[PDB]
UniProtKB/Swiss-Prot annotation, chain A:
Originating gene: csm5
Protein name per Swiss-Prot or TrEMBL: CRISPR system Cms protein Csm5
Function: CRISPR (clustered regularly interspaced short palindromic repeat) is an adaptive immune system that provides protection against mobile genetic elements (viruses, transposable elements and conjugative plasmids). CRISPR clusters contain spacers, sequences complementary to antecedent mobile elements, and target invading nucleic acids. CRISPR clusters are transcribed and processed into CRISPR RNA (crRNA). Csm functions as a non-specific ssDNase. Base-pairing between crRNA and target RNA to form a ternary Csm complex activates a ssDNase activity; target RNA cleavage suppresses the ssDNase, a temporal control that prevents uncontrolled DNA degradation. Viral RNA transcripts probably tether the Csm complex to the viral genome, recruiting Cas10 ssDNA activity which is able to degrade DNA in the transcription bubble, spatially controlling the DNase activity.
Assembly and oligomerization: Part of the Csm effector complex that includes at least Cas10(1), Csm2(3), Csm3(5), Csm4(1), Csm5(1) and mature crRNA. The Csm complex is elongated and slightly twisted with a maximal length of 215 Angstroms and a diameter of 75-80 Angstroms. It has been modeled to have a central protein filamant of Csm3 subunits along which the dsRNA helix of paired crRNA and target RNA binds. The filament is capped at one end by Cas10 and Csm4 and at the other end by Csm5; ssDNA is thought to bind to the N-terminal HD domain of Cas10.
General remark: Encoded in a type III-A CRISPR locus.
Family named by the database record: Belongs to the CRISPR-associated Csm5 family.
Species for this entry: Streptococcus thermophilus
Curated annotation (Swiss-Prot), chains B, D, E, F:
Recorded catalytic activity of this chain's protein: (2R)-2-phosphoglycerate = phosphoenolpyruvate + H2O
Binding site for (2R)-2-phosphoglycerate: 163, 343, 372-373, 394
Gene3D superfamilies assigned: Enolase-like C-terminal domain, Enolase-like, N-terminal domain
Cofactor note: Binds a second Mg(2+) ion via substrate during catalysis.
Family recorded in the similarity comment: Belongs to the enolase family.
Active site: 205 (proton donor), 343 (proton acceptor)
Provenance organism: Streptococcus thermophilus (strain ATCC BAA-491 / LMD-9)
Name of the protein this chain belongs to: Enolase
Binding of Mg(2+), residues: 242, 291, 318
Lineage of producing organism: Bacteria, Bacillati, Bacillota, Bacilli, Lactobacillales
Curated annotation (Swiss-Prot), chain G:
Name of the protein: Enolase
Family statement: Belongs to the enolase family.
Transmembrane segments: none
Organism: Streptococcus thermophilus (strain ATCC BAA-491 / LMD-9)
Described purpose of this protein according to its UniProt entry: Catalyzes the reversible conversion of 2-phosphoglycerate (2-PG) into phosphoenolpyruvate (PEP). It is essential for the degradation of carbohydrates via glycolysis.
Cellular compartment(s): Cytoplasm; Secreted; Cell surface
Gene: eno
Included stretch of the parent chain: 1 to 145 of 434
């Protein structure tokens, strides 16, 4: 019944908008005003300590 | 948009194989209405008379081509251009165009067909149910059916003077249940009559006319059918009568000669003895209705019958009032009867039908919308009964689509009304006391 | 859904692409079944006839939905999803973090 | 296109300067209906109660913001999505949502305003007159107006115990002529009071409240005004009374004490003495109707009054029945009064108002559609009176537009009806004899 | 705009007082169609069966609530969304949704009601007459009616084994004249039976069931009625028979036992003797039609009867073919009969009805659209007969609105067609030589 | 679709029981407008005169059948065919058709009724509020009401020469608050007069006429009512006067003889003494408005009064200007008054009313839209006051629908405008310094 | 039919060759209104300021792409939904959306273009002359030039 049509849908959860004061400016986490995060996303940096 | 563009009549057949007419009304926007006229009487002292051809080479003189031509060549030109929602104006214009008290010039059938067709076309234009258009927003009461089940008098050859015996399922919760009860009692009576070797083929109204021993035999067989179906007489289903005493009434001897239908050994009763006989029947059987218990001219007898029995049994005047407003007003003033049988073709228009119904209601009387011997597939009288909230209908037995069409229309009305639909049963007899 | 209605263009597309003539039927677990077994299950009560079928698919990325309108007290038309709403947004959550080595 | 899309409510003022509410209904296609509520009573054991804010800082505690919020927040979300022509369903839904026998949760004013607004929006959608939508195609009878002329009791400082005196121009040929006769008698009485030194300022209902020497002086002055206008008392214009005997009835001693409003020397009457005094007034003056002749809880005295005077004089139960179905049924069964005063805000729903009207009609009673002391520019009760063909209305005197609006609406209705309109006059008192 | 948005079934009554159902189809633009189902058979190996409740408490196990729920819950979800003019697609979807050869899961009554309601709603949407929508632009032929006038067999206690006797007014110029001739012959027969002392009450199909001495007596009385109306037997009016020979067929001995209905002394006839008897009846009387002259399983007897009488007498297979395409194809291949009786509820769908009519017509057979014992006010079979240009109908006698409605619809169709309307009469029997 | 199709006038009563007319305008698409004319005066040298019949046998010579006949038989034939939005064209065509400067041939009432009906039909056709159609998009200012709370002069038997005393709640934040304050002050004064023993029954405009000792006593009682309601005189609520100084001005000796109303002990004042009296009243009490403080023909007295008090109080010319742009031009030129009372029926059309309002605005004068003694349920003057952003209205007291209807319409307009709505209050007196 | 569905601004030229912007407003039934803004001053103590690009490469710093983007991306979403005849409500909503007394955030030119376009579209929807829509029925005086 829950048919997968074409490549499917995008999973977009809702969590409060947060802005990071990165040393380049002010980077908002999302580009939409309806507070739509891409659920399951993260970033990483890997070093060789 | 609602201006009447076309009025057209044609000649069709009624339920008895006799000709009647039907009228179709078309407006500018395409709203359509069709009204079919029941077969009435071409003779009458103060009742609206229908127009018959009188050509003995066509339908035995019962053709309706003259009234069809009256609609097509006289009424149509007068009515085309009117607003379809001007029912009172159209009916008044047709009455003035006829110019006679009994509607004899144009024919009561022609005028009634145009009235019904105009009302149905106006309901079609407004996209409302016909009963909503006719009776306004507050139309909820499904009439209590008074179903004819056994015929006597001139409708049968059995020794019974009374013309109709009927079952009134006034103890049912809804109209659907009342119809199911009536159908089951009808089939139980059919089984009982088959067991007794009596005839089962139905009459004009769909009821039986068996060879009974007398009135008491027929009433007792009806009670047996009620109990075989599984219902209590006097609590769930009651009995009504249509004596039609004008048929066996000696005008000059002032007696009710039962010998015309019950053999030479019958009882020739005066008006007083007829009152005691009806009181005996009411005290013996669960009889809640008596129709035409006295002659149409026995005004003193009607007053005495209303004094004796008017508080416990409904007394209906069919030929007593012949849906005439003058007769109904006189009967109200003289305290004769407490119910009037409403026949739309005996008066001529829907406006005067509703006027008679409201005059009867305002005086405490009950209006019973009634069928005729020759009916059609048209079921406007069910919409009339619901629209006026009359609470009672007399539309025949449970055996021919001339009668079953009205019951089907009442089922449709009840389904449409839904939770606001009301069936009152014994409460519909507001002319009675307790 | 009261703030929106089915758009007329999508309704026309569904109409003469004839998607309603190619319905698919499902059981209580949402598995595709023939119309005969769907009717059998609905009659025996093992399937809910309301939420157990689909109207194929409308081709062409059309918007399924348009805004629904209503009347204001002035007698003017207005979209149902616009208005006084509320008033609570703060400004943001500035989380500093001026040390993250951002990759180019 | 007929789906109710918007239900707005706001607080407005009534004719007394006290707050009330009004409700506007918009359907999908833009059909619009506005219903205003007359001011009623927030207290009462067996009448629908209206919701007041109770904030003594605003309007002396008489504001209607709570019921306006009930319409805007509670009722609107339930009603939106209904069909505007489903008046019975909407009314039943509002009654169920209130969940109280006296409609005390949402308020009777809120429910009545939504009912009137829905009915008017449905009439606007169908492009039909409001009386045509409410009563169907057979709406023709222009009501006979019993219009207030003189006040007493608690409405005046005069030594008169009877609350209201009314003129009924039942001898008029049309409603237009009846209104003209009423206006001319009103102005003639104004001139007579001016030439006698009495004050001609009007009260809440538009009638004068001068100081007299008693009831007999008031009726004599009204008869003198009727003759001075050029009309015959007892043939052209009749006198009606509204005693409001509940105001000067002592329940402990079971006596009607006129000493409350007529001074120390007034006579104290029992039930039999009160009936004798009403009978002498009827036999002395052309009095055709008496309203609240006995106390609202004096069922035996009401029955005796109907036994004596109920054949020739109309007896209207205002506080006796309080437009309650149960009280009307009990009075019909007990033969108490022969008329009911119908106030639409005493129940709070058009469906129940029409149900009460038909129940009173079926028993031979007359229904008198009545105004309230705090009225609005809404003139729906005129369309209610015409739609039901009640034949009697009571909408105050010939001064403040809160009364004149209903008379103007009846003039409009008569003009639209044209040749169909009927003014029965004395014939609308069908509850009497001959 | 033509997309079906609502399918709703409700349980109504039929012409015999037994439950059936009716379906209503509403499309997007407001086009409305109503289809009522004649009562058929719930049992049968090779014909479509109807769905009955079987609950003995309600209607003696004949309720149709199960099939109403099948329409409202199963068929409604599938059909809502289709184009209303997709009659074949909707019908094939319903057949696939049922899945059984006999349509026993959903019920043949349910499927047929939805089929008729969809066809009528499509005709209403297109604003065209139903026969024009069903049969195309070339709809001109008015069927020659076979009017049942005398009943025997199982429908009468007389010693007659033939179930029905019919009059065929094939000598009329138009259908209107044919209907007038049938009604006048009906009334002449009624007068003859009244003079003879025989019973005149009508049965299920509107005809009489008198107590004749035999088949010859009934045919002679029919001829006397024809001549009393002023018409010539064998030129103006012919005689048809419905033997229903399966009822008095002794299958074990392969013999036709007339002793079942015609008394103990009745003759016993084999297949050859039965052919000889039918041929003798054809020679003695103006018989143009014989229906079910042999048993539904006597294929060799049917072949011999068609070889002997098929060139001059119409032989109709009612129980022989059961509106079955397979049985009709087998009969066409084996030269059994030259006509088929078409009952829409015996097949369950308009598409399959028209397929059977087309198959019969392409083989030189005539298709006779027929009625059932329990009919309704639905007159769709008249539109089916005119739409297919079948040229023959069998819709009962001239005495009940379940039969008169079809004749009235045929009169309306003839009036609509005007000059285009055709009545072949004897030329509608194209299966017969010359 | 906007072309005027029907113009129909009928005779209806007003708030005083005196006849007037109402005009209904119907356009081609069905847009409807109704205009009801307030009762003015049929005399006056430079005032537009209404047309009365003079038939002393009908309504005492105050019937409006002649104006109704003028609309139906003269105006309608000229106006039908116009575009409904051509308000200026229709008004100028009616003015030219009448042909007289005072609109005496057709009656100013007929012209005004047609103008209002056309304007409202044009607002209905455009589906815009009436104030939006009349005044454009920038209509936001709710007028500051001067509620007539106490009467005098020729409207009372007390020894007060000043005709009206009014309360001006100029300090309220919104119009809703101002109306609530006015109603509460009205009820507080009602209670004060009841406990003092004076009269309570309302007058022509809803105000009281008690038995005061003089002007100072009445103003002090009004201040006591303002303080008892809980508001601050001179900061929240102010006093206004309507002296009607032309009633007690004797042109023979050029004096203002107060002895006409205030008894033999009153003071006879010259123009300088009258200005001194008005100035001392302004100093004593928080009086912001003085209307008709000088005789309508005392131009030097008016100029001296404007020189003395025109900087701090508002001097309104009611009988001075007579809604006549000629007299306004003269007054603006000679610096006589600082406001004009605008009575729409004193000029005859909406176009000339708006021309007078714009001429008053261009001179720094304020325009006060006013009621009449005989008002109706029509509430167009509220839409005129809002549409012109006049900022002031004089529509009566807080106790009769003829007055409450305009306040209710203003409440509706404020609710509709929402946050855009503005109530300037003291800032609406832009003709005064500080 | 009367509800604003599209608000689109574009950059055009004025009578002096300097840039300005125009706004097109489309309602549901197809009513159309176009408003052009006269070139004013972007500096002032207590006057509404227009919003210029300041990019000296394009048009000498007098470009109007900023105001066009403000209409297309800020004003249009806020205004779509309103009735086109709700001129006062639309103007008050734009004033509140800007938030500054001098209309310097969105730009006075952008707000004026939307205001004029909405008024013209409302006059087009009602099928009335623009002066009739703006001033009511009593508009008759031709100005002295
Ligand atoms: Mg009878
Ligand atoms: Mg009372
Ligand atoms: Mg057969
Ligand atoms: Mg004045």
């Amino acid at each position: 019944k829950t048919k997968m049509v074409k490549k499917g849908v995008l999973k977009l959860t809702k969590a409060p908008l947060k802005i990071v004061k990165i040393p380049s400016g002010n980077h908002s986490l999302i580009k939409n005003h309806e507070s739509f995060y891409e659920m399951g996303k993260a970033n990483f940096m890997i070093k060789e300590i | 948009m609602s201006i009447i563009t076309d009025v057209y009549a044609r000649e069709v057949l009624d339920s008895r194989g006799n000709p009647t007419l039907e009228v179709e009304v078309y407006t500018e926007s395409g709203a359509f209405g069709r009204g079919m006229v029941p077969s009435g009487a071409s003779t009458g002292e103060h009742e609206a008379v229908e127009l018959r051809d009188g050509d003995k080479a066509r339908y035995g003189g019962l053709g309706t081509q003259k009234a069809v031509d009256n609609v097509n060549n006289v009424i149509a030109e007068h009515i085309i251009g009117f607003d379809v929602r001007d029912q009172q104006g159209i009916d008044r214009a047709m009455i003035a165009l006829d110019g006679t008290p009994n509607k004899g010039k144009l024919g009561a059938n022609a005028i009634l067909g145009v009235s019904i067709a105009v009302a149905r076309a106006a309901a079609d234009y407004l996209e409302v149910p016909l009963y909503s258009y006719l009776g306004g927003f507050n139309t909820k009461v499904l009439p209590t059916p008074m179903m004819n089940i056994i015929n006597g008098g001139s409708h049968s050859d059995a020794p019974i003077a009374f013309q109709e015996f009927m079952i009134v399922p006034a103890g049912a919760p809804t109209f659907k249940e009342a119809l199911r009860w009536g159908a089951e009692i009808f089939h139980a009576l059919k089984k009982i009559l088959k067991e007794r070797g009596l005839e089962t083929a139905v009459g004009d109204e769909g009821g039986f006319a068996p060879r009974f021993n007398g009135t008491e035999d027929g009433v007792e067989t009806i009670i047996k059918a009620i109990e075989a179906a599984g219902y209590v007489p006097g609590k769930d289903v009651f009995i009504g009568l249509d004596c039609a005493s004008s048929e066996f009434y000696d005008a000059e001897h002032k007696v009710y000669g039962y010998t015309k239908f019950e053999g030479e050994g019958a009882a020739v009763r005066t008006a007083a003895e007829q009152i005691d006989y009806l009181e005996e029947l009411v005290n013996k059987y669960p009889i809640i209705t008596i129709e035409d218990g006295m002659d149409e001219n026995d005004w003193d007898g009607w007053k005495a019958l209303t004094e004796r029995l008017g508080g416990k049994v409904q007394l209906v005047g069919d030929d007593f009032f012949v849906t005439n407003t003058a007769y109904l007003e006189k009967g109200i003033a003289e305290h004769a009867a407490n119910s009037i049988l409403i026949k739309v073709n005996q008066i001529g228009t829907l406006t005067e039908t509703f006027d008679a119904i409201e005059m009867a209601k305002e005086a405490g009387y009950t209006a019973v919308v009634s069928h005729r011997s020759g009916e059609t597939e048209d079921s406007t009288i069910a919409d009339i009964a619901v629209a006026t909230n009359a609470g009672q209908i007399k539309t025949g037995s449970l055996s021919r689509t001339d009668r079953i069409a009205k019951y089907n229309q009442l089922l449709r009305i009840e389904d449409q009304l839904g939770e606001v639909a009301e069936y009152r049963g014994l409460k519909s007899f507001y002319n009675l006391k307790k | 859904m009261k703030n929106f209605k089915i758009s007329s263009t999508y309704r026309a597309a569904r109409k003469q692409q004839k998607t309603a003539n190619r319905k698919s039927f499902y059981n209580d677990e949402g598995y595709m079944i023939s119309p005969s077994e769907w009717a059998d299950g609905v009659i025996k009560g093992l399937i809910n006839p309301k939420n157990s079928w689909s109207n194929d698919h409308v081709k062409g990325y059309l918007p399924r939905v348009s805004p629904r309108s209503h009347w204001t007290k002035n007698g003017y038309r207005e979209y149902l999803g616009i208005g006084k709403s509320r008033d609570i947004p703060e400004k943001e959550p500035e989380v500093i973090e001026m040390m993250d080595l951002e990759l180019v």
